[PDB]
Structure formats: structure tokens, C-alpha cells
Structure 1
């Protein structure tokens, strides 16, 4: 099936989740600190009249990062909640095909939260599932 996903990297590792689950993208400016915050969250911002949490994606997944290099908040959108994910550079919208999609995630930390792995143009773009990632951050 022809799914169109939002492509972006963290420490030269490619990732992506669907465009279906996107609210917007912004640059981090004054994220309000919440005292006694769990290790993977930065704080909260007001966007589109709502109070959006800004999580730090790589600290949920279990992968490397730099917090002065990372400066892009990708704001997501499910029926349940809208949450921003702080990361590095962004690429943009990519239509993927099932023919170059593999389901092997046996050795991955976030491999039961990954829909697959897209082997497009010599890159290893891992396809995430927003739902199961948001179920982990909730308390």
C-alpha cells in the first residue's frame, strides 16, 4: 500500500511515522519547565490554543542524541492526544511501497512499536507506530 510518511533523522539514524498523524512542525522556543518531570520530557508549550507536551523521542526509543544540536519539534496528532517530539533535522514527505518494506524487528529496542523497516535508496528508514509510542509516555 502507498503510505506517505514524514522522514527525519536522529544522530544520522533514519526514522518516520505517517502524515495522517501530524499537526505541524516548529523550532523550539521557550518550552515551559514542569517540576518533577520524567527523563524523556522537556516540558509544555501552548500551540493552536492547546497545551502540548514536548517529549524527547530518542529517550523513549533508547538511542543516542545531542540536546544542543536537536532543535526541531514535530507535533503529532492522534484521536486521543497531540504531543510534540523534539528531534534533529527533518526531510519531509515520502511515499513508501510494500515491496521495499520488511517486518524483521527481532533485535530492536522499539521493535514492537515499529510497523516495519523501509529499505529505500540505500537507507534504513524505520517505520514507527505513533499509538504504541504514546501509550508508553502516559502515566
Structure 2
């Protein structure tokens, strides 16, 4: 651990492909990517949560942030799944092909995180090396995961 902390130009993150455009989640919260499909089909009940799974005496809910957010995504090339711990919530997001480690630059954060690049349902839009990508620290997306109920 650096501890001293300094500079905030580049940043490591979790990333996957999303209908031609790239997408990344603050690898800090993101635990690891898991390969699976058609999770918890009969136990349906809600709507957002596509599935769930029991493990280590704790069930985790898998949803599609790309759905909560929107993006080009539309369950077209979806295949891989992602896990993320959030305020005692082991959340999950299914994607197409997750590249994993990503060299995302984050000019957003500096004083205490601030950017409306795509703060419609997350932190915001990301861009690097003349390439388009979506980025989020699962903060607003998770917040909605819990308070989803409302209509």
C-alpha cells in the first residue's frame, strides 16, 4: 500500500465490453468476475435481480448495472458475471466479456470525487487513449440496488 497517496491521473479498474463501448467499475469495490448464466430462475420474485446464489451462509443478488444505468447494453452479448461488495452487500453485475484489470484514468476524483460525465445512474462516463468507456464506483448503482423499490 502506498499510504502516502499522490497523483490521480491513471487508475486500475474492472472492465468489460458493453455493446461496442467499454465499461469499468471501481475495482476497489469490485471483488472478482464469475462465469455463470441463468442464475436463480425459479426463485424469481423481484425484477431487477436476474438471479442470486447461496454461498458461505450468504446469498448474493446478481443484477445488470448496465440495465439500471442503461448504456448501449440490451442483453445482446451478455455472458460473464461480476461480483462486488457494497455496504455489507455482495452485489453482482452480469456483462458480456469482462477484460478485468483496466487502465482507467480518473480526472474525476481530486478533492473528493466529482464528475457529471454520466452521473445519471452512476459516477460518470470515462475516456482514455481516444477510446470511449463507461465508469462507475458502484455508489449510485448500488444505492439504487437497495432502494430499488419505489416505482
- Fold match (TM-score > 0.5): yes
> Taking structure 1 as reference, are residues 109 and 38 closer, same or farther at Cα in structure 2, changes over 3 Å only?
farther
Tell me the CA shift for residue 9 of structure 1. 1.8
Tell me the CA shift for residue 63 of structure 1. 3.3
Name the CA distance, whole Å, in 1 between partners of 2:80 and 2:67.
15
Q: Which runs of 5+ in 2 are unaligned?
A: 1-8
Q: Which runs of 5+ in 1 are unaligned?
A: none
Larger radius of gyration: 2
Question: Which of 108, 112, 115 is the equivalent residue of 1:107?
Answer: 115
2:116 touches 2:123 (CA, 8 Å); kept in 1? no
TM-score, L = length of structure 2: 0.71
1:103 touches 1:117 (CA, 8 Å); kept in 2? no
Alignment root-mean-square deviation, CA = 3.9
Tell me the CA shift for residue 13 of structure 1. 1.9
Name the CA distance, whole Å, in 2 between partners of 1:59 and 1:91.
19
Match of 1:85, SS state, is: strand
Tell me the CA shift for residue 135 of structure 1. 1.1
Match of 1:95, SS state, is: strand
Larger mean Cα displacement after TM superposition, 108-117 or 123-132: 108-117
Does residue 22 of structure 1 match 2:30? yes
Q: Provide runs of 4+ in structure 1 moved above 4 Å.
A: 98-110
Number of the residue aligned with 2:11: 3
2:123 touches 2:140 (CA, 8 Å); kept in 1? no
Tell me the CA shift for residue 100 of structure 1. 9.4
1:2 touches 1:98 (CA, 8 Å); kept in 2? yes
